[PDB]
Write a protein that binds this ligand. Structure first.
Ligand SMILES: O=P(O)(O)[C@@](CO)(COCc1nnn[nH]1)OC[C@H]1O[C@@H](n2ncc3c(NC4CCCC4)nc(Cl)nc32)[C@H](O)[C@@H]1O
Ligand SMILES: O=P(O)(O)[C@@](CO)(COCc1nnn[nH]1)OC[C@H]1O[C@@H](n2ncc3c(NC4CCCC4)nc(Cl)nc32)[C@H](O)[C@@H]1O
Ligand SMILES: *[C@@H]1O[C@H](CO)[C@@H](O[C@@H]2O[C@H](CO)[C@@H](O)[C@H](O)[C@H]2NC(C)=O)[C@H](O)[C@H]1NC(C)=O
Ligand SMILES: *[C@@H]1O[C@H](CO)[C@@H](O[C@@H]2O[C@H](CO)[C@@H](O)[C@H](O)[C@H]2NC(C)=O)[C@H](O)[C@H]1NC(C)=O
Ligand SMILES: [Ca+2]
Ligand SMILES: [Ca+2]
Ligand SMILES: [Zn+2]
Ligand SMILES: [Zn+2]
Ligand SMILES: [Zn+2]
Ligand SMILES: [Zn+2]
Lengths: 525, 525
């Protein structure tokens, strides 16, 4: 006997409730838009009507990304995941962005599906308060069988979000194995690991956690595909990606890029003892060929009414593509980063009363903080809604005084694990940096010139290790985020500045028409 | 028996009627201001009271440079040169900026001193109208002797000014020699060549024109000094500069920088036959240690009242020194050039579909005529801007082949080192020169902002591609020897008035801070 299971999966949807452009920015030309929950619902139902055994799983980071989340604060997540009848969700790092209070009340209490993480352990007064609102696993009836779904969440959540001091994030593999072993003693012979630690950790789970049949992941925005890919995303490997486990088995690993653009689809043939005989599938592109379900669409447009205040006023105009995509902004100089750094610098010089920062000419900005492009076609209008998707996190652009030695180490940290699509890669203003990636980690910065301070005419001069420099940067970086521990520990002064989104909108309003270029601020030799 | 003559001389005063800052920009801090006609008058009288034989000579380019000339149109030049009792002036190129009618009516008819040029010949109806209003020479009584003063004016005047089609500008050496020979047959044994063609031409006149005892020049802003110089100007050689003529004699050549900052002072010992036995002197720095003459200052203040409308409104603020000096803007990237090119680009995007993505700018360095100072709250008025951009040109739009553009960048540095105005300031262009290479093949790198691209980046210029550039009408019309532009351009549209563009930009930006960014570089070998 064989038993067939269809796994449908989303990850890193990031508040893209409505359909979007091809690059996940706002939908303008409806005929070429993609994703959104209403389209997803249609494709899910087509599969459900065709296959008997279907699970619809989310691998986390539903929270944060557009004005949907700014206004509704996770209540939209509960509502539309409930309407889609998700079977389970794993907690991502962004689910803790509004604290544990912003997780509990909006999402955990209102979800009609189990929410999972086996490596998150509650301590003190929070333990009884959150008890049973999330679970380490759920065992789900699927026709005549059961399927065990075990959850996990990135160990980096305390450095990326606001989980608070009364949660502990354990190692995934140490936390998962006892739960998986327990499930076997409970006669659960089919086990899916569902979680939010990235493709590299997903592969290690597949390899090391004995009993895991399939891994459904998130957090790295990993596109996997078998065959000719249907859009711009370049596959990192085949779908499914096959890990050869230490216990001698083939464990498929899946992810479905991000932003609800694709629906993950994996058909698994199990034997009677719960072992994978075979699996096949591919992410399904949610393009115009799949219609938006009318009922969901009507419900989305009902919730949309409150959001239209944010798209009323044109702040200004771009005449160039504002490339705020992760493929650009985490690997090389991107023009959206240049815009944000120039706005940071420009708006700080408005504050003429405060003398200590009134010539600040230097800027750093983590590429992973840039969260959407903006499109120039159809008259390139920029509203608050457009900006909210670029800069969703509600942080500030703060002022720090740093030694040149601290800054050189930050630029080394910027490319220490380069190639892995990590957020710590720095966009800059008033700095020209040259990297040589063939050199060893910690010695890749071959040139670092900065705008002078004690000079009448600003020019780019070599950074001196013993000099001191005034930089404008996100509070996330000032507070030691993205492993920038040298900044937090070595900084000499640190002042709070203005709110990030307000800074960029003011700049755009003043400039009216923007046209930021890639200029050679970051080069590679 | 020896006979001693003191030559006092100014050149390229360029409408600096009032005292100025050290760099010839507007006077703000009075205790460190310099020049102006009232201070000059004080120093002239001190010399005149002490030496019996004194001539005060001007070597041209009184016309053009500040709102004095905008408002009074040369009437200020006549009035204050008359008050100083100049003995003679040679016509410079800028004396023709308002046409021959702008020379005749304001200056030639109202000057109480001879105005000189021996290589300017009037033809047709103009000949009888201008007859005797300027002269090729004047023979001046000085004590019990006479001194011949023979005039000359740059051959380049028709390509730099508006002399009109009824003047011919002859070769200096060919035009001077017959007049100098004539003067000898009239028993004038002491001859000064006074003129406006530049230090290199001045040297050739000294060398080749037999009978010339001394050359007093202008037009190259050449600082000559013997000993330790008193201010920021680097001497190009000794004062006087000694030429060995073809007939073996030692001919002193003098110039006195520009802007009325210095008074040229040369003592000459003549024998009874009019040979130069010896000479010595130096330019005298007209700093605060010489008081402004009270009567001239009172008169200046009377004429000043009309001008104060131009200094009423603050257009905006700079927080950096705006280096618009010739020593910067004709030799390397200057930040005033970057400001003007960015203003040109920015203002054009306000408007017309064919030019609405123009990202490339070229600007002749010699068109930038003053710095602006950042100290004392760095205020920018119209008066400040009028000294930067005095010429009343427009910022025009051209379509050009890449081959035309590469040839322009070769012409930009073909005779580099001579302080010539054709050196180009740029926007949306990164140019690298190797000066060790031969003239016409110094451009080793030339990258430009792309047009048919979503994200603007700097890509190598293609010889066969076509490019859209914003530039002065002076360069569009083939000025500064940019003959390739006029002859090869594919379209040419008139744009906005130059000063209005820069003031609008400053008003929009409020606070400006242009840097030297690496738009123009020089390579090692
Ligand atoms: O799955 P995640 O966690 O979202 C993903 C993991 O690699 C993949 O995101 C792909 C993607 N999605 N959309 N665009 N890019 O990126 C995370 C990256 O985001 C940046 N970051 N993380 C947090 C954060 C922040 N503060 C928060 C603290 C409390 C709440 C707000 N402020 C800023 Cl300016 N930047 C921040 C970092 O550079 C980080 O490395
Ligand atoms: O003694 P001159 O002639 O002024 C001096 C000779 O080398 C030395 O000037 C040192 C100095 N003085 N103050 N600052 N720099 O520079 C002349 C340089 O000036 C620029 N130029 N010349 C004319 C001109 C123009 N049109 C005119 C037509 C009617 C009147 C206006 N438009 C423009 Cl944008 N630029 C123009 C060129 O680059 C030229 O090469
Ligand atoms: C929506 O996506 C599908 C999936 O990629 C596209 O369908 C493909 O179309 C091309 C021809 O244009 C064929 O070579 C493929 O075989 C099709 N794949 C299928 C049906 O799975 C479709 O073109 C997209 N819709 C658009 C562009 O409107
Ligand atoms: C005005 O310029 C003169 C130079 O002509 C300055 O006088 C010189 O001052 C230094 C000391 O500061 C002496 O070593 C020189 O011997 C002086 N030279 C002459 C010719 O007097 C004078 O300081 C300047 N005035 C200022 C700065 O107000
Ligand atoms: Ca199994
Ligand atoms: Ca003689
Ligand atoms: Zn995510
Ligand atoms: Zn994540
Ligand atoms: Zn001049
Ligand atoms: Zn001149």
């Amino acid at each position: 006997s064989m038993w067939e299971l269809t796994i449908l999966h989303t990850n890193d949807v990031h508040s893209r409730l409505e359909q979007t452009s091809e690059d996940s920015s706002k939908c303008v030309d409806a005929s070429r838009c993609m994703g959104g929950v209403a389209r997803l619902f249609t494709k899910v139902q087509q599969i459900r009507r065709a296959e008997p055994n279907v699970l619809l799983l989310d691998a986390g980071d539903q929270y944060q990304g557009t004005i949907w989340f700014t206004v509704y604060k996770g209540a939209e997540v509960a509502h539309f995941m409930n309407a889609l009848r998700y079977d389970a969700m794993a907690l991502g790092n962004h689910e803790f962005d509004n604290g544990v209070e912003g997780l509990i009340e909006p999402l955990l209490k209102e979800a009609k599906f189990p929410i999972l993480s086996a490596n998150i352990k509650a301590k003190g007064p929070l333990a009884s308060q959150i008890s049973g609102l999330y679970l380490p696993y759920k065992v789900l009836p699927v026709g005549d069988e059961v399927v065990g779904i075990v959850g996990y969440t990135s160990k980096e959540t305390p450095f990326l979000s606001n989980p608070g001091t009364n949660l502990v994030f354990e190692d995934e593999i140490t936390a998962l194995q006892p739960e998986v072993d327990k499930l076997k003693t409970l006669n659960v012979n089919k086990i899916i690991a569902l979680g939010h630690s990235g493709f590299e950790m997903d592969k290690l789970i597949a390899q090391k956690v004995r009993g895991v049949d399939v891994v459904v992941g998130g957090h790295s925005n990993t596109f996997l595909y078998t065959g000719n890919p249907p859009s711009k995303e370049v596959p990192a490997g085949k779908y499914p990606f096959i890990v050869t486990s230490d216990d001698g088995r083939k464990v498929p690993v899946v992810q479905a890029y991000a932003f609800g653009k694709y629906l993950g689809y994996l058909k698994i043939e199990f034997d009677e003892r719960g072992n994978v005989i075979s699996s096949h599938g591919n992410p399904i592109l949610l393009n115009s060929s799949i219609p938006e379900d009318p009922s969901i669409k009507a419900d989305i447009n009902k919730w949309r009414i409150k959001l239209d205040d944010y798209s009323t006023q044109e702040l200004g105009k771009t005449i160039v593509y504002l490339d705020g995509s992760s493929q650009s902004c985490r690997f090389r100089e991107c023009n959206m980063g240049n815009l944000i750094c120039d706005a940071m610098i420009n708006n700080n010089l408005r504050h003429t009363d405060e003398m200590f920062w009134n010539h600040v000419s230097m800027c750093i900005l983590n590429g992973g903080g840039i969260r959407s492009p903006i499109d120039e076609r159809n008259d390139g209008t920029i509203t608050w809604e457009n900006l909210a998707a670029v800069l969703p996190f509600g942080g500030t652009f703060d002022l720090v005084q740093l030694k040149g030695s601290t800054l050189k180490k930050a630029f080394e940290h910027s490319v220490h694990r380069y190639g892995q699509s990590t957020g710590e890669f720095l966009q800059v203003g008033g700095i020209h940096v040259v990297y040589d990636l063939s050199r060893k980690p910690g010695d890749r910065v071959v040139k670092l010139d900065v705008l002078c301070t004690k000079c009448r005419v600003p020019s780019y001069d070599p950074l001196k290790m013993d000099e001191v420099y005034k930089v404008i940067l996100p509070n996330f970086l000032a507070n030691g985020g993205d492993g920038f521990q040298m900044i937090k520990d070595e900084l000499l002064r640190h002042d709070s500045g203005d709110q990030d989104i307000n800074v960029v909108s003011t700049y755009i309003s003043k400039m009216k028409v923007i046209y930021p270029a890639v200029e050679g601020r970051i080069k590679f030799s």
